[PDB]
């Protein structure tokens, strides 16, 4: 039987509420051991080792825990005996952790993130099936070299493309610019596409000696916008700013002016969008070259932040960072 | 023939680029008169009066223009001769303008917002058809008392529900929590649903004597989040803050602490979500009553901002504002 | 406590498989009584009476069972003590039964259909939450006069608009031409829109004296299509044919010829589409008036069949049936 | 400049209506030469040769034309000078043609299918931009070995996954089980994923010596279904039947009995679904091995028909055909 390690971080999958029919609960309340005992059929599939990396709601995730988790995954997958890793994780920021790992894990062995939109104490809790299916994906031969994936609601999503697109639904995960790469239905795994953007072994990023990640803020654009948040981010030592712009990455004028100043001072300014999907494109209404900005293209603000944080471990050059957004 | 007024504000619909096959352009470059001449068939449908309210990209919209526009629409619709108003507008913040008008226009006569994702100079420009269809919706008997609507890509969307969900696509408008209320296909108008949330005549808000709207900022949540933007918004005189939270409206703990302080100081803190769709609910992981926050429920951050701005014209009470978010 | 009757028909909600982690199962295997005992919290909400109408997979539904079910619902809702009815039903044809009831139930009291995409024996079975939520929708004051609704996956869908759009997903139900009318999240019910198309009390149809429904066949269009299936449907006594056409209701020429003959012989031919969404429109590429056909507009083939079956209980006139498709 | 051949077959892209503001038109009314002259900017990109293969609405497509087209594409791509082929085609059955070519074209050079939902005579006609973008995709270096693609509405869809999902919308194309593999925005081409199912050079099918394809019918399932259409298809010499079943490929019992007889007589019976998306799976409610049926898995009925037609050129064995549906 293949050997897999499950790394637990917390989340609603390890969550608990007082009533099976009320929505109120606490995430990251249940230990890995207790979680794995709820789904005994996984032991028929693999030899499982569990480990507790953290016990938090993913809304409390930090770069420190990301670094810890990436180093540990890399350690585990370097072992001959370990065929894959599964990470149990809150859904709120699962897309950030997955995207981070997709660019920092140096292996072609599967890494699967899995969560739940309902706590295990809930009626019709989704976690048990999601976990069963994640183990099936982790051990499947076709899961090699697919990059880091999210397995939720019978779907396999590529880390670069995945996002949580709804606040409460069990089907909240989507890949709005592509779609899922595969399915897993009562454990039966099928892939239909793969990412052609570089990941994992092909990624230039390496965090093995990094203790702290660069600071990157995200700003939310709107009419009658301001300059005070740009200024506050600068004052707090931001090395990069993601601007979640109106439509195709458009800023309000006051804000644009403040961002132009930030970019002159050596803070990388990257244009994304608040809309939800599509590319924040070059050569539309904003002259990025003149203003000193990067266009994030087909990402979203929160994943663009992760990519910019990694870019900043190597460079702050505008062109070099544009190339990184145009590659990964 | 019915008489309709077209109020122009600018946008890509009145936009212009150097090449029909390149994506670069300037919004709000074409006058209303020139715009109406591109689509002569509208004169077969109605007697059209055009009026220039502004000439800007909608990313430059301000409350001052919203107020000017709302007062002018109310004036026009009070006239016996005027059957409807159409507003030509940039797509980037069309949803904010429409939502604002939906709560401030005191008439049951149709108000239709229309724009274009491609400028009129482009190959396969969408503006002409969108405008033709908007005039048909404006004059349709079933359009009465539907509230303010957006007409884009052969669809009719309710202002409360509509959002721009894609950066570039002609089909970027959606109503992710409901769906379109009707269709318009080569001028043929059909409605299938209507909003059951109060709007227009049934709205408690009145801006007739308002010259400036309260300041409301929006913050974008993520892992390793900060308190400095909350603090900067407070220091700039924010009367309300929309927090675009992780998943179902969840803040990072440092940020939560700063928001709790903001709310004690008398600044209304309203929880929305960065995810895109769904309700930011009460009684999930965040104890809104204990912390002093409002849950925005089934809105998004930019529309929640508009509602909170209107609410703040008369109250900063947490419970009264919750009731407003739970009603409109 | 409000009194509600649950009418069980079978389906995967009342289904059973040998293993909680295998996809294989039998629908309609579990009695109503056993089903209701799996979700004891419903008794806190209402006084429940259960009844067994049938015990089948919805793929075995027949017009006979529809008639039985509609007469029984009408009987129950005529009682002063009965506040609503819930029907437990297979998901495969739930949209047909719901649409049928939406046009034959003569009450404004709620009628809620509910099912499950996973049997109750499955890990992470959806039925229990779906049922809990359906009871909440049934007793909610705002559910009056909404027409017949489907409650699945925390969503409330209008019967006219709902369809099963995926083979296996718990979120398989959608309303592709509108969207859901409301939500129900751990029992909390909210409506955002309502249908403006006539239903229930406003429907002209009455099945109280009908023992058998007219025969209507559905044909699937494609390139290199044939005339032999039209001819076979005619020979078997079809009173109507739904043609699920290519794109916007387009037939292949051989088939068109056979359909033209059918329509001359007095068999109503109604044009729908195989695509999934949108209106099958008048005055596009097919000259319906010349050929003797009806355009089904914004329905799908299977719901168009139900509507045509009901239309045929009153008339076979082409114009009158066009008007019915243009109204309901 | 790269040399490309444009093969015209007809469709709404080569369509014409009497009015730019009315929906009525005739497809396949405009010659290739006239079509290419509407979009002169394509001559800046490539050296274009046009060729008229047919002049029809795609609803009139036949296997004879498919064969003619496939042989001609293979001929053209065998030429050293020809870098790609673009096929202008009606949208109604573009997905069938693309899928067929995806299994029969023995080259890695790009083949792009393109159409339009509005005729060139219409206001805001989509054809010009779609064609411009198709030429850019055809000449892009990353388009090699992606298989046959559909380019519509700024999107690039894999032939195996694409379908027309709406009757009238310019954005009617989708890939509901995956999503688009790339984008093309004012000619700028980007790929994000690729199919991992075998196509083109890797396909086992060869039609070079085929003059006529096997007959395969499609049936549309519903409640109170019949056996007469199965019987009529058998009597007309069907070699295969696609059954568009209820939910996850479920037949009505009378129909099932007739299909079981068809399969005993040596006619291949393949189970698909009427629902629109998802896999019609093995080992759910239907025992395919016992009954003698194939499960079509993640296709739809019209594409399953194409695959079964190709399969039938060499085998009618149930297990061999299952393996084909489970591979391609
Ligand atoms: N707040 C939770 C939500 C979930 O897991 O569904 C988390 O992200 O940890
Ligand atoms: N920036 C433009 C975008 C558009 O109209 O499509 C505007 O909103 O004015
Ligand atoms: N075949 C089942 C499927 C389900 O209920 O999910 C039925 O419709 O009865
Ligand atoms: N009936 C037309 C529809 C279109 O091209 O849009 C065709 O498929 O040829």
Numbering used by the authors:
A (entry chain B), B (entry chain A), C (entry chain B), D (entry chain A): 3 to 330
What does the paper say about this structure?
Since all of the four structures presented here were solved in the presence of ligand, we expected the enzyme to adopt the closed N-terminal loop conformation in all structures. Indeed, this is what we observed in the WoA-P121 + Asp structure. For WoA-P121, soaking the crystal briefly in Asp solution was sufficient in closing the loop. To our knowledge, the WoA-S121 + Asp, WoA-S121 + Glu and WoA-P121 + Glu structures reported in this study represent the first L-asparaginase structures caught in its fully inactive/open state in the presence of product ligands, while the WoA-P121 + Asp structure is the first closed/active state of WoA reported so far. An identical Asp binding mode was also observed between the WoA-P121 + Asp and WoA-S121 + Asp structures, despite the former having the closed, and the latter the open, N-terminal loop conformation. In this comparison, WoA-P121 + Asp represents the closed/active state of the enzyme (pink), whereas WoA-P121 + Glu represents the open/inactive state (green). As the catalytically-relevant state is the one where the N-terminal loop is closed, to better understand how WoA-P121 would accommodate Glu in its closed state, we modelled into the open WoA-P121 + Glu structure the closed loop conformation as observed in the WoA-P121 + Asp structure. This modelling reveals that whereas Asp fits without strain into the closed active site, binding of the larger ligand Glu (Glu has an extra methylene group relative to Asp) seems to be incompatible with loop closure due to several steric clashes. When residue 121 is a proline, it strengthens the closed-conformation of Tyr27 ( ), which in turn stabilizes Thr14. Hence, the extra interaction provided by Pro121 (but not by Ser121) suffices to promote loop closure, rationalizing our observation of the WoA-P121 + Asp structure being in the closed conformation.
